[PDB]
Amino acid sequence: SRPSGAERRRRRAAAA
RNA sequence: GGUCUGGGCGCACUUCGGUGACGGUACAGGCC
């Protein structure tokens, strides 16, 4: 969309 | 940052939708 900033916090939170 | 968001930016991917724990949680907001 770009990724929704919250969606950046979800990137690392998919993993950690 | 407990954590979620929002929508771009300055960059790289790609079906051009979204994917990217990159500058960077930085910006401004929710129960902090």
List the determination method: NMR
Q: Which residues lie below 8 Å from residue A10, measured CB to CB, with a gap of 6+?
A: none
Alpha-carbon distance of A9 to A12, in angstroms, equals: 6
Q: Which residues touch strand B (CB under 7 A)?
A: A 1-16
Alpha-carbon distance of A12 to A4, in angstroms, equals: 14
Whether the upstream peptide bond of residue A2 has omega within 30° of 0, thus cis, is yes
**DSSP for chain A, written as a single string:** ----SHHHHHHHHHH-
Separation between the CA of A5 and the C1’ of B23 (whole angstroms)? 14
Alpha-carbon distance of A15 to A2, in angstroms, equals: 20
Nucleotide nearest to A7 (CA to C1'): B5
Alpha-carbon distance of A7 to A14, in angstroms, equals: 10
Q: Which residues lie below 8 Å from residue A7, measured CB to CB, with a gap of 6+?
A: none
Alpha-carbon distance of A1 to A16, in angstroms, equals: 24
